[PDB]
Write a protein that holds these residues in place. Structure first.
Motif, short mmCIF file in Angstrom:
data_model
loop_
_atom_site.label_atom_id
_atom_site.label_comp_id
_atom_site.label_asym_id
_atom_site.label_seq_id
_atom_site.Cartn_x
_atom_site.Cartn_y
_atom_site.Cartn_z
N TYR B 137 -11.94 31.35 16.46
CA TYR B 137 -11.12 31.58 15.91
C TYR B 137 -11.74 31.84 14.06
O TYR B 137 -12.87 31.48 14.06
CB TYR B 137 -10.65 29.89 15.81
N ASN B 138 -10.49 31.56 13.49
CA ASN B 138 -11.24 31.50 11.94
C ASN B 138 -10.34 30.08 11.32
O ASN B 138 -9.88 29.28 12.02
CB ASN B 138 -10.56 32.90 11.04
N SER B 139 -10.78 29.77 9.85
CA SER B 139 -10.14 28.51 8.92
C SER B 139 -8.53 29.09 8.67
O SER B 139 -8.59 30.34 8.71
CB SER B 139 -11.30 27.44 8.27
N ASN B 141 -5.58 27.37 6.48
CA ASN B 141 -4.41 26.44 5.08
C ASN B 141 -3.32 26.41 5.59
O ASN B 141 -2.19 26.75 6.51
CB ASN B 141 -4.40 27.07 4.02
N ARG B 160 -4.71 34.23 11.44
CA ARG B 160 -5.38 35.51 12.15
C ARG B 160 -6.06 35.54 13.40
O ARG B 160 -7.07 34.95 13.01
CB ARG B 160 -5.88 35.71 10.81
N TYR B 192 -1.48 20.34 2.05
CA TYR B 192 -2.38 21.14 3.05
C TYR B 192 -2.71 20.43 3.16
O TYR B 192 -3.54 20.05 2.97
CB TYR B 192 -2.83 22.66 2.49
N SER B 194 -6.16 21.88 6.21
CA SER B 194 -7.31 22.58 5.90
C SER B 194 -7.99 22.76 6.88
O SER B 194 -8.87 21.74 7.33
CB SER B 194 -8.56 23.16 4.66
N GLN B 196 -10.48 23.59 10.97
CA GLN B 196 -11.65 24.31 11.07
C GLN B 196 -11.62 24.47 12.49
O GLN B 196 -11.30 23.12 12.94
CB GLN B 196 -12.51 24.02 10.25
N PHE B 215 -11.99 20.07 13.07
CA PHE B 215 -12.27 19.14 12.35
C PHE B 215 -11.20 19.48 10.56
O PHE B 215 -11.16 20.91 10.31
CB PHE B 215 -13.70 20.20 11.15
#
Lengths: 221, 221
Positions: B137-139, B141, B160, B192, B194, B196, B215
Motif C-alpha cells: 500500500y502507499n500513503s 490524504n 493508488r 485532512y 494523513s 500510512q 498510522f
C-alpha cells in the motif's frame, strides 16, 4: 543461516549537509524470514537538519524476504557475515544531492550498518531544507542488477516524498553494492524489491527521532 | 475518553462482487492517542475473490490522532459511543465499483465495525479481478468536510493501487458519514487525514488473510 532467527541491528550514521553537522543512532530488530525490519533512530546531535523521511533510504536490504526459489539471488546475505559496502547518490528533485558510503557487516551477533552522509546543493527555499515533506512514506520498487565485473550489485529506483501541499518531491537513487570480502559471492538475476515503510512516533521519546516499520519482499524472477 | 487507553476492535464484513460470496472477520487493537491501528483479517469463507489490498479502505477513522488543538473537529469520536454510519462508493479505474455501508459503534468495550460490501462491473480481464495488484500500500490524504444539513461529514480522497507491472490502479472514493444517534455531534472545519498503511503476512496463519499496520494523523487546520 544468520537470519533464521531475529537479528539485532544497530545504525551509526554521521551526516553533513550544507555544513550542518548531525548524528543519528539507530537500533532495532529485523526478521529476514519475513522481510520485516524494526528500528528506532535518535538524532544524537540534537535537531535533525534535514527532514527525517528524507533519510530513510540511508538508514539494510539483507533483511528482505527472498522466497525459497529466489534464494540463490540473495546477494546481500551472500555477502554475510563479512558484510558489503553500499554507496549511494541521491538526487532530490530541484534541490540538492545526498552521497553516502556505508559499511554493513556482522559485528558480533548484531548486524551493524555504518554510514557517512554527505549532502550539497540544498536550497534554503527548497522542500528538503525548509521541512515541507510530510512525516510518512509510500511504497517502492528497488531494482537490482548483478554488476559482473565489480562482483557486486547495482541498483536504481526512485522515491517520491510527499510535500505538505500534496506535491511529489522526487528522489533519484544511484545505488552500488560491493562485497567486503573474498568469500565468493552471489551475482543475481535481474529482480526487484517491493518495500513498505511507515515512519511513526514514540510518546515516550523526548529526543528528536523517527520510528520506522519496514516490510520488504524480493519479487521479480 | 473511550480512546485514552488501547481499544479492542472487531470487524465483520460481508461481501459480494459479480456474485462471488465471501466473508472477512477482522480483529485487533487501536491506540487513538497515536493514530496507530493494528488488525488481522481472515477470509472466513475461504478464498478472497478480490485482492486483499483492494479492500483496505473498507476494513475506522475514529482511531486517528487528532492533535489537541484540532480536538474540537474530531467528529468520529464525537459520534461515540452511539457510533456512526459510513457509506462509500469506490471507483477503481477502468474496472468496476464497490459500494459499502457500515456500522461502527461501541459494542461493549470493543469498537465494532460492520460492513456489507457490494461490487459490480469488475472485468474478468481487469487488474482487480485477475489479481494484478501488489501486496502493499502507499500513503494518502483523506479530506473531510462537515456536511451541515446532514449533521454528518463528507469525504473524497483517492487511492493508488500498484499493479505487478508498476502501473497505478486508481480508486476514487465517495465517502459519507452520518451519526447514529441524536447526542449532538461535532461538525468540523475542512481538514485532512494523513494515513500510512502496511499490509503484511503471518507465518502462523494457514488461512487466507491480510495483516495491516495503520498510522493516521489529523493534520489540516
Amino acid at each position: 543461516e544468520l537470519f533464521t532467527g531475529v537479528v539485532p541491528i544497530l545504525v551509526e550514521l554521521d551526516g553533513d549537509v550544507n555544513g550542518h553537522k548531525f548524528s543519528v543512532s539507530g537500533e532495532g530488530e529485523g526478521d529476514a524470514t519475513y522481510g520485516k525490519l524494526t528500528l528506532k533512530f535518535i538524532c544524537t546531535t540534537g535537531k535533525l537538519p534535514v527532514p527525517w523521511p528524507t533519510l530513510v533510504t540511508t538508514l539494510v536490504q539483507c533483511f528482505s524476504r527472498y522466497p525459497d526459489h529466489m534464494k540463490r539471488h540473495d546477494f546481500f546475505k551472500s555477502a554475510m557475515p563479512e558484510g558489503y559496502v553500499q554507496e549511494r547518490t541521491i538526487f532530490f528533485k530541484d534541490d540538492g544531492n545526498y552521497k553516502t558510503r556505508a559499511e554493513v557487516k556482522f559485528e558480533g551477533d548484531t548486524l551493524v550498518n555504518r554510514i557517512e552522509l554527505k549532502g550539497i546543493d540544498f536550497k534554503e527555499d527548497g522542500n528538503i531544507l525548509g521541512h515541507k515533506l510530510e512525516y510518512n512514506y509510500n511504497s517502492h520498487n528497488v531494482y537490482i542488477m548483478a554488476d559482473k565485473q565489480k562482483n557486486g550489485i547495482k541498483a536504481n529506483f526512485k522515491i517520491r516524498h510527499n510535500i505538505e501541499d500534496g506535491s511529489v518531491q522526487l528522489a533519484d537513487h544511484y545505488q552500488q553494492n560491493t562485497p567486503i570480502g573474498d568469500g565468493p559471492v552471489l551475482l543475481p538475476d535481474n529482480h526487484y524489491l517491493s518495500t513498505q515503510s511507515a515512519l511513526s512516533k514514540d510518546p515516550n521519546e523526548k529526543r528528536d527521532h523517527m520510528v520506522l516499520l519496514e516490510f520488504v519482499t524480493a519479487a521479480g524472477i
